[PDB]
PDB file of C-alpha atoms in Angstrom:
ATOM      1  CA  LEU N  10       0.000   0.000   0.000  1.00 37.46           C
ATOM      2  CA  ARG N  11       2.493   2.590  -1.207  1.00 39.08           C
ATOM      3  CA  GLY N  12       5.792   2.530   0.667  1.00 41.18           C
ATOM      4  CA  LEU N  13       9.169   0.784   0.612  1.00 42.08           C
ATOM      5  CA  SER N  14       9.821  -2.348  -1.431  1.00 42.40           C
ATOM      6  CA  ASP N  15      12.599  -4.799  -2.309  1.00 43.99           C
ATOM      7  CA  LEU N  16      13.355  -6.409  -5.673  1.00 44.97           C
ATOM      8  CA  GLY N  17      16.682  -8.157  -6.197  1.00 43.50           C
ATOM      9  CA  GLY N  18      17.229 -11.744  -5.079  1.00 40.79           C
ATOM     10  CA  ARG N  19      13.786 -12.518  -6.488  1.00 42.62           C
ATOM     11  CA  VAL N  20      14.170 -10.993  -9.937  1.00 40.60           C
ATOM     12  CA  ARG N  21      17.748 -12.258  -9.812  1.00 43.55           C
ATOM     13  CA  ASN N  22      17.015 -15.989  -9.747  1.00 42.99           C
ATOM     14  CA  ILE N  23      13.857 -15.625 -11.807  1.00 43.62           C
ATOM     15  CA  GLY N  24      15.759 -13.314 -14.137  1.00 41.55           C
ATOM     16  CA  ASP N  25      18.713 -15.534 -15.006  1.00 40.25           C
ATOM     17  CA  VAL N  26      16.259 -18.438 -15.050  1.00 37.26           C
ATOM     18  CA  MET N  27      13.399 -16.862 -16.986  1.00 35.73           C
ATOM     19  CA  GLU N  28      15.812 -15.812 -19.710  1.00 35.80           C
ATOM     20  CA  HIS N  29      16.249 -19.507 -20.388  1.00 37.26           C
ATOM     21  CA  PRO N  30      18.210 -20.004 -23.677  1.00 37.29           C
ATOM     22  CA  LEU N  31      14.942 -21.131 -25.246  1.00 34.24           C
ATOM     23  CA  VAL N  32      13.193 -17.973 -24.103  1.00 37.56           C
ATOM     24  CA  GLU N  33      15.888 -15.757 -25.581  1.00 34.69           C
ATOM     25  CA  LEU N  34      15.883 -17.601 -28.892  1.00 31.94           C
ATOM     26  CA  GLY N  35      12.095 -17.544 -29.148  1.00 34.43           C
ATOM     27  CA  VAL N  36      11.972 -13.808 -28.476  1.00 36.93           C
ATOM     28  CA  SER N  37      14.895 -13.148 -30.810  1.00 34.99           C
ATOM     29  CA  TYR N  38      13.159 -15.011 -33.631  1.00 33.25           C
ATOM     30  CA  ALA N  39       9.875 -13.155 -33.127  1.00 33.91           C
ATOM     31  CA  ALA N  40      11.781  -9.880 -32.920  1.00 37.10           C
ATOM     32  CA  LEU N  41      13.504 -10.604 -36.213  1.00 34.59           C
ATOM     33  CA  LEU N  42      10.222 -11.025 -38.055  1.00 37.32           C
ATOM     34  CA  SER N  43       8.755  -8.039 -36.263  1.00 36.23           C
ATOM     35  CA  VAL N  44      11.568  -5.821 -37.549  1.00 35.52           C
ATOM     36  CA  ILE N  45      11.051  -6.982 -41.119  1.00 34.02           C
ATOM     37  CA  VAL N  46       7.291  -6.703 -40.877  1.00 31.87           C
ATOM     38  CA  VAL N  47       7.427  -3.015 -39.980  1.00 29.16           C
ATOM     39  CA  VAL N  48      10.137  -2.423 -42.573  1.00 31.27           C
ATOM     40  CA  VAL N  49       8.036  -4.017 -45.302  1.00 32.90           C
ATOM     41  CA  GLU N  50       5.138  -1.708 -44.506  1.00 32.03           C
ATOM     42  CA  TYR N  51       7.429   1.316 -44.298  1.00 30.91           C
ATOM     43  CA  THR N  52       9.289   0.463 -47.493  1.00 32.19           C
ATOM     44  CA  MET N  53       6.583  -1.300 -49.503  1.00 35.24           C
ATOM     45  CA  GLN N  54       2.956  -0.178 -49.507  1.00 35.09           C
ATOM     46  CA  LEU N  55       1.191  -3.419 -50.430  1.00 36.78           C
ATOM     47  CA  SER N  56      -2.528  -3.210 -51.172  1.00 35.89           C
ATOM     48  CA  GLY N  57      -5.084  -2.806 -48.403  1.00 37.30           C
ATOM     49  CA  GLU N  58      -5.695  -6.555 -48.507  1.00 36.81           C
ATOM     50  CA  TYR N  59      -2.145  -7.600 -47.624  1.00 34.44           C
ATOM     51  CA  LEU N  60      -2.044  -4.737 -45.154  1.00 32.33           C
ATOM     52  CA  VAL N  61      -4.913  -6.253 -43.246  1.00 33.60           C
ATOM     53  CA  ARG N  62      -3.110  -9.580 -43.009  1.00 32.89           C
ATOM     54  CA  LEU N  63       0.130  -7.853 -42.077  1.00 34.85           C
ATOM     55  CA  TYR N  64      -1.514  -6.001 -39.201  1.00 31.94           C
ATOM     56  CA  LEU N  65      -2.998  -9.238 -37.903  1.00 30.23           C
ATOM     57  CA  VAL N  66       0.307 -11.041 -38.035  1.00 28.10           C
ATOM     58  CA  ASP N  67       2.032  -8.085 -36.387  1.00 27.43           C
ATOM     59  CA  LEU N  68      -0.511  -8.204 -33.584  1.00 27.40           C
ATOM     60  CA  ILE N  69       0.332 -11.814 -32.777  1.00 29.51           C
ATOM     61  CA  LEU N  70       4.016 -10.990 -32.540  1.00 28.47           C
ATOM     62  CA  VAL N  71       3.178  -8.373 -29.941  1.00 28.51           C
ATOM     63  CA  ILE N  72       1.299 -10.955 -27.872  1.00 30.58           C
ATOM     64  CA  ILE N  73       4.407 -13.103 -27.539  1.00 31.74           C
ATOM     65  CA  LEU N  74       6.448 -10.062 -26.556  1.00 33.54           C
ATOM     66  CA  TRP N  75       3.770  -9.051 -24.071  1.00 31.94           C
ATOM     67  CA  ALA N  76       4.260 -12.456 -22.468  1.00 33.70           C
ATOM     68  CA  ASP N  77       7.667 -11.511 -21.057  1.00 32.86           C
ATOM     69  CA  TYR N  78       6.755  -7.888 -20.380  1.00 28.90           C
ATOM     70  CA  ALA N  79       3.427  -8.853 -18.838  1.00 24.83           C
ATOM     71  CA  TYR N  80       5.194 -11.395 -16.646  1.00 23.47           C
ATOM     72  CA  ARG N  81       7.429  -8.770 -15.048  1.00 27.62           C
ATOM     73  CA  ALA N  82       4.544  -6.294 -14.927  1.00 29.90           C
ATOM     74  CA  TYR N  83       2.462  -8.489 -12.627  1.00 30.41           C
ATOM     75  CA  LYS N  84       5.552  -9.655 -10.782  1.00 30.82           C
ATOM     76  CA  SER N  85       6.333  -6.091  -9.752  1.00 30.01           C
ATOM     77  CA  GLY N  86       2.808  -5.969  -8.339  1.00 29.46           C
ATOM     78  CA  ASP N  87       2.511  -2.482  -9.835  1.00 30.70           C
ATOM     79  CA  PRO N  88       1.959  -2.481 -13.630  1.00 29.58           C
ATOM     80  CA  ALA N  89       1.429   1.281 -13.691  1.00 29.62           C
ATOM     81  CA  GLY N  90       4.761   1.873 -11.996  1.00 27.24           C
ATOM     82  CA  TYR N  91       6.466  -0.868 -13.989  1.00 27.29           C
ATOM     83  CA  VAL N  92       5.315   0.859 -17.168  1.00 25.70           C
ATOM     84  CA  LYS N  93       6.640   4.266 -16.162  1.00 26.26           C
ATOM     85  CA  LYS N  94       9.936   2.461 -15.694  1.00 24.47           C
ATOM     86  CA  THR N  95       9.905   0.686 -19.062  1.00 23.33           C
ATOM     87  CA  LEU N  96       8.956   3.833 -20.935  1.00 22.55           C
ATOM     88  CA  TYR N  97      11.911   3.121 -23.198  1.00 26.28           C
ATOM     89  CA  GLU N  98      10.341  -0.274 -23.939  1.00 28.83           C
ATOM     90  CA  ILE N  99       6.923   1.086 -24.873  1.00 26.97           C
ATOM     91  CA  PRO N 100       8.111   2.288 -28.322  1.00 24.50           C
ATOM     92  CA  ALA N 101       8.960  -1.355 -28.945  1.00 22.29           C
ATOM     93  CA  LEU N 102       5.427  -2.575 -28.247  1.00 21.54           C
ATOM     94  CA  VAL N 103       3.613   0.396 -29.789  1.00 19.44           C
ATOM     95  CA  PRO N 104       0.958  -1.659 -31.662  1.00 17.38           C
ATOM     96  CA  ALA N 105       0.357  -0.630 -35.273  1.00 15.99           C
ATOM     97  CA  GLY N 106      -3.389  -1.054 -34.846  1.00 16.58           C
ATOM     98  CA  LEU N 107      -3.426   1.334 -31.900  1.00 17.80           C
ATOM     99  CA  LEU N 108      -1.602   4.039 -33.833  1.00 14.77           C
ATOM    100  CA  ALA N 109      -3.587   3.295 -36.960  1.00 14.62           C
ATOM    101  CA  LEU N 110      -6.877   4.268 -35.323  1.00 18.72           C
ATOM    102  CA  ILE N 111      -5.269   7.260 -33.646  1.00 20.54           C
ATOM    103  CA  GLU N 112      -3.624   8.346 -36.893  1.00 20.98           C
ATOM    104  CA  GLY N 113      -6.975   8.159 -38.670  1.00 19.63           C
ATOM    105  CA  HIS N 114      -8.619  10.253 -35.962  1.00 19.54           C
ATOM    106  CA  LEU N 115      -5.996  12.978 -36.323  1.00 17.09           C
ATOM    107  CA  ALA N 116      -6.282  12.940 -40.110  1.00 18.75           C
ATOM    108  CA  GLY N 117     -10.072  13.111 -39.924  1.00 21.21           C
ATOM    109  CA  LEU N 118      -9.826  16.210 -37.770  1.00 20.85           C
ATOM    110  CA  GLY N 119      -7.665  17.800 -40.462  1.00 22.77           C
ATOM    111  CA  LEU N 120      -4.302  17.519 -38.697  1.00 23.14           C
ATOM    112  CA  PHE N 121      -1.111  16.907 -40.678  1.00 24.91           C
ATOM    113  CA  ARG N 122       1.520  18.208 -38.265  1.00 25.48           C
ATOM    114  CA  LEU N 123       1.188  15.210 -35.946  1.00 23.01           C
ATOM    115  CA  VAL N 124       1.219  12.901 -38.950  1.00 25.42           C
ATOM    116  CA  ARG N 125       4.613  14.257 -39.980  1.00 24.47           C
ATOM    117  CA  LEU N 126       6.081  13.580 -36.538  1.00 26.97           C
ATOM    118  CA  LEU N 127       4.395  10.200 -36.535  1.00 26.89           C
ATOM    119  CA  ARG N 128       6.146   9.267 -39.778  1.00 26.83           C
ATOM    120  CA  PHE N 129       9.546  10.060 -38.278  1.00 26.95           C
ATOM    121  CA  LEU N 130       8.560   8.012 -35.259  1.00 28.97           C
ATOM    122  CA  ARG N 131       8.015   5.016 -37.502  1.00 27.25           C
ATOM    123  CA  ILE N 132      11.584   5.121 -38.797  1.00 26.90           C
ATOM    124  CA  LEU N 133      12.911   5.797 -35.300  1.00 32.48           C
ATOM    125  CA  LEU N 134      10.814   2.964 -33.936  1.00 32.93           C
ATOM    126  CA  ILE N 135      12.565   0.502 -36.245  1.00 28.73           C
ATOM    127  CA  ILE N 136      15.967   1.826 -35.199  1.00 28.77           C
ATOM    128  CA  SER N 137      15.080   1.297 -31.543  1.00 26.96           C
ATOM    129  CA  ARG N 138      14.269  -2.370 -32.139  1.00 26.46           C
ATOM    130  CA  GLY N 139      17.432  -2.526 -34.226  1.00 29.47           C
ATOM    131  CA  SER N 140      19.291  -2.839 -30.926  1.00 27.90           C
ATOM    132  CA  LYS N 141      17.518  -6.130 -30.238  1.00 31.44           C
ATOM    133  CA  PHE N 142      18.519  -7.487 -33.639  1.00 29.70           C
ATOM    134  CA  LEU N 143      22.115  -6.337 -33.255  1.00 32.07           C
ATOM    135  CA  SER N 144      22.299  -7.881 -29.802  1.00 29.86           C
ATOM    136  CA  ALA N 145      20.941 -11.204 -31.061  1.00 29.66           C
ATOM    137  CA  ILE N 146      23.455 -11.496 -33.887  1.00 30.96           C
ATOM    138  CA  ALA N 147      26.266 -10.234 -31.695  1.00 32.14           C
ATOM    139  CA  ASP N 148      25.692 -12.944 -29.100  1.00 31.73           C
ATOM    140  CA  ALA N 149      24.781 -15.526 -31.733  1.00 29.04           C
ATOM    141  CA  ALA N 150      27.978 -14.835 -33.667  1.00 29.67           C
ATOM    142  CA  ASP N 151      30.079 -15.324 -30.549  1.00 30.88           C
ATOM    143  CA  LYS N 152      28.264 -18.566 -29.829  1.00 33.03           C
ATOM    144  CA  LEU N 153      28.165 -19.747 -33.424  1.00 31.49           C
ATOM    145  CA  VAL N 154      31.742 -18.907 -34.423  1.00 33.93           C
ATOM    146  CA  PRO N 155      32.053 -22.128 -36.482  1.00 38.01           C
ATOM    147  CA  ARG N 156      35.539 -21.233 -37.683  1.00 37.67           C
TER     148      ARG N 156
END
């Protein structure tokens, strides 16, 4: 009920354990596709049909990611606080569907300024996730190193 708290030994064991090699690989794989998915939409502008399927697929990827994030969220016992702490992680989950509806609302009102900033955010959003991709390959390369 609002006050002091402790989070170390707990998140420590559960941390090094939760990040089980399988967990890391699974997330890394999903992240890889996620990066390409957003890039495809940014680069290519497939028809509305494919776009619908792309959004659906993208949504699923978020669910898997939410699994890990959601796990820690409840663990902290304070999702609201946990979120304010992972603010730098939000941009990574920013669902396309959520922005899509918001973007449409702004456009309907006759706003284009926000749209411009939003576009830049899209490119920046990909760069942010780029760290995850780079980290995966970096570690993978060290582990793989076949010769």
